[PDB]
């Protein structure tokens, strides 16, 4: 019976591979050869945000493009006003080690997680005027790598126990559990409609999950190393992935296979974060060489390099309006580029 | 100049937050951070309990020696895989690796673990303090002459006690030989490929010893002295 199961699984994998190979009728490089070059996309450090004491590890833009929330291993969440570089909130953390931060789309809550295995949701609209730990959701048996807000009540988290959980913040229980990954779920990205999302783990795999159904609809295994970053294409029909292999990869959900690989001989380090521009034609990737790269999504050509960092770039995020980008590095500096 | 009243008030609030941040900076740079790693059989729990008598994750333990504040961070609930969450633990003053010297059956896995810590990309700079716990159990096993180290480790048959090493008083030659060979087993790996950016400080400790904190203090003093000798162009 067990041997029959293994052979059937191998046959199903062969069938899926055959279908994927059949679907590949044309390649994007050939399709977009005539598209005009993007040119030299050069960026400048408009603002430098200072005040953190240790390595910045997480960042997240709000619905508005004026507020950032950054997390530091010293044990602080600092909310900065990008337009004026003002620390609106300075929330201490019980656990010094912080690896993920989130900002609710409405802006009424901020999440914080890490090795403590507890997701702390803090309320900034308190009548008392002091930020408080509104909720401390526990249950995960591994460190939290990412957390994103679907709404004020529901928050999705990914832990180091090779699982993800949907938490009703008020009730504080795992409403739905997503399991199947072979390694730590480093990266999470929610779709624009929030009905679907993508999770990339350390087993060189990414999975497409539906929040309601609770199943991994699609699996992608294009990378040769651990996946440390995943982001959603703006349309919602593709996602970019950055892994330890030093190469970014585009995977489209409809065709169910990779659509481009971005790699250069000059880079041999891993990728920390990945994001897209509003149109999706500029893939921004942070690298361990203290440099960030702006590739052309549709043609795979390095459009620019942002080298204004002194340590590992750990966080990367493009505004909702797309006017600027924000990079957080282990040098304790959060810098805005445009 | 162009700023309005509420903008100036927000700026003042930002200055207050920056002042609080500097206040926290003083303590943060004053505090010394340590990463307590050890096997389940290794008596890390015993040392942790000793310190504070002077699905949770990281367990902290703060102690003070000679007015120096030491935070010690223990990783209990993290998954078996270690390659990823070691990154957050760089920039630590020392990695206190606790190894069970009593059980020779699992000492090979302990050596492999120490090698993994030593040759990690992110922990190349940081120093490791090696505490070989349960020295009393080591002596009992060696002098009961029932468990032979040669069975697990072949080379022990050829190894000879180093004359440079100083034997402890009231210690049989067999216990000295066994303990120093187990030390040399780790020291050989530590010295090779280290390149001098990180150093190991093996120490022989027992279960309920009271000198663990002072040994850690001395090791941290040495590590900081070397760090300064490099950062001040003295080497």
């Amino acid at each position: 019976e067990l041997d029959q199961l293994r052979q059937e699984a191998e046959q199903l994998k062969n069938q899926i591979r055959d279908a994927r190979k059949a679907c590949a009728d044309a390649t994007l490089s050939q399709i977009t050869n005539n598209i005009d070059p993007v040119g030299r996309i050069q960026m400048r450090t408009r603002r430098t945000l200072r005040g953190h004491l240790a390595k910045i590890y997480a960042m997240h833009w709000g619905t508005d493009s004026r507020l950032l929330v950054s997390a530091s291993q010293d044990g602080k969440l600092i909310i900065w006003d990008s337009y004026t570089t003002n620390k609106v909130h300075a929330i201490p953390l019980r656990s010094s080690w912080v690896m993920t931060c989130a900002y609710a789309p409405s802006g009424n809550y901020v999440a914080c997680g890490g090795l403590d295995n507890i997701c702390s949701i803090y309320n900034l609209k308190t009548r008392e005027g002091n930020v408080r730990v509104s909720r401390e959701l526990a249950g995960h048996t591994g460190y939290l790598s990412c957390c994103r807000f679907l709404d004020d009540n529901q928050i999705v988290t990914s832990s180091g126990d090779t699982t993800c959980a949907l938490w009703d913040i008020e009730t504080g229980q795992q409403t739905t559990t997503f399991t199947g990954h072979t390694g730590d779920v480093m990266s999470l990205s929610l779709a624009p409609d929030t009905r679907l999302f993508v999770s990339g783990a350390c087993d060189a795999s990414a999975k497409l999950w539906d929040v309601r159904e609770g199943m991994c609809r699609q699996t992608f295994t294009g990378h040769e190393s651990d996946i440390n970053a995943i982001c959603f294409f703006p349309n919602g029909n593709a996602f970019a992935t950055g892994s330890d292999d030093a190469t970014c990869r585009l995977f489209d959900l409809r065709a169910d296979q990779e659509l481009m690989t971005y790699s250069h001989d000059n880079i041999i380090c891993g990728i920390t974060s990945v994001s897209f521009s509003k149109s999706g034609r500029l893939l921004l990737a942070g690298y361990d060489d203290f440099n960030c790269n702006v590739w052309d999504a549709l043609k795979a050509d390095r459009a620019g390099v942002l080298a204004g960092h002194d340590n590992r770039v750990s966080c990367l995020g493009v505004t909702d309006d797309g006017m600027a980008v924000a990079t957080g590095s282990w040098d304790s500096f959060l810098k805005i580029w445009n | 100049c162009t700023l309005s009243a509420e903008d100036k008030a927000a700026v003042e609030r930002s200055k207050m937050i920056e002042k609080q941040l500097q206040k926290d900076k003083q303590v943060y740079r004053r505090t010394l951070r340590l990463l307590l790693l050890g096997a389940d059989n290794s008596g890390k729990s015993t040392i942790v309990k000793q310190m504070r008598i002077y699905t949770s994750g990281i367990f902290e333990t703060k102690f003070q020696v000679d007015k120096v504040n030491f935070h010690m961070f223990d990783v209990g609930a993290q998954r078996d895989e270690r390659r990823k969450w070691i990154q957050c633990f760089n920039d630590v003053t020392a990695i206190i690796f606790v190894v069970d010297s009593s059980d020779y059956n699992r000492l090979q896995e302990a050596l492999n673990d120490f090698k993994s810590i030593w040759n990690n990309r992110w922990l190349r700079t940081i120093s490791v303090i090696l505490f070989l716990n349960k020295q009393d159990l080591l002596a009992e096993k060696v002098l009961a002459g029932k468990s032979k180290i040669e069975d697990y480790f072949p080379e022990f048959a050829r190894y000879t006690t180093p004359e440079d090493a100083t034997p402890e008083p009231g210690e049989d030659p067999r216990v000295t030989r066994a303990k120093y060979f187990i030390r040399k087993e780790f020291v050989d790996i530590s010295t090779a490929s280290g390149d001098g950016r990180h150093i190991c400080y093996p120490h022989f400790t027992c279960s309920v010893d009271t000198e663990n904190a002072r040994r850690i203090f001395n090791d941290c003093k040495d590590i900081i002295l070397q760090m300064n000798l490099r950062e001040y162009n003295l080497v």
Partner: single-chain antibody
Framework: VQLVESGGGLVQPGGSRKLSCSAS????????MHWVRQAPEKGLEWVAY????????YYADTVKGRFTISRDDPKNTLFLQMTSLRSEDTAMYYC??????????????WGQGTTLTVSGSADIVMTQATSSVPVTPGESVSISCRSS???????????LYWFLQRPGQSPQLLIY???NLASGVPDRFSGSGSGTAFTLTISRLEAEDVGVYYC?????????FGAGTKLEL
Amino acid sequence: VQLVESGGGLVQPGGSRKLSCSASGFAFSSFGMHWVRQAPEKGLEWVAYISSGSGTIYYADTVKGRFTISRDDPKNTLFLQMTSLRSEDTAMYYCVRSIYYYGSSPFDFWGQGTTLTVSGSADIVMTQATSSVPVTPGESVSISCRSSKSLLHSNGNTYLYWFLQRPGQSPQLLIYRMSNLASGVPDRFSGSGSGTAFTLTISRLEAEDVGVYYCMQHLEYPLTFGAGTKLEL
């Protein structure tokens, strides 16, 4: 959140009395404090302001110098030492709290008020021509005000605050910047404007709406209010 005030009684001209203001239920240190006087059968006026941490302290022109403001954070209390009392100073003094950060709601909580019975320049002038605007329940009401100087700033914010003081009750905040409804305010209330003339509209009138509506500016710290329009049932 409750701010209770005490230390106001019968005083004669030239006396010196201290008002005390005790807060409970919120971070007193983080918030800034303001003193607002309501003279009997008169409008609102701003007395003094102390920032969080005492890094910025301001006083009104009328009481410039004579009155002092000081806060004792460890005891969670605020003081006001009066000097050279005059017959014009008789009024009910309230404590207001204001935290200033992006997306804040300044002048949010007001204190009950201590009665005191004794015995201008380049300051925006706020005018509310309609002294009385009688309306019936269920009908929409409108209140119009103006400013000599434009209340809009390069940052892009209109610094106009709409408050309502009900019969025998302390003032409350309705709109903090010309468009935004304060916490706990019915959605009926709404505010609009252009920079020189502003309107506050109540969609349907109820029995807890009646009162005197005041408009205040915050472009310059000599914060000014209006005569206030009274809505009758």
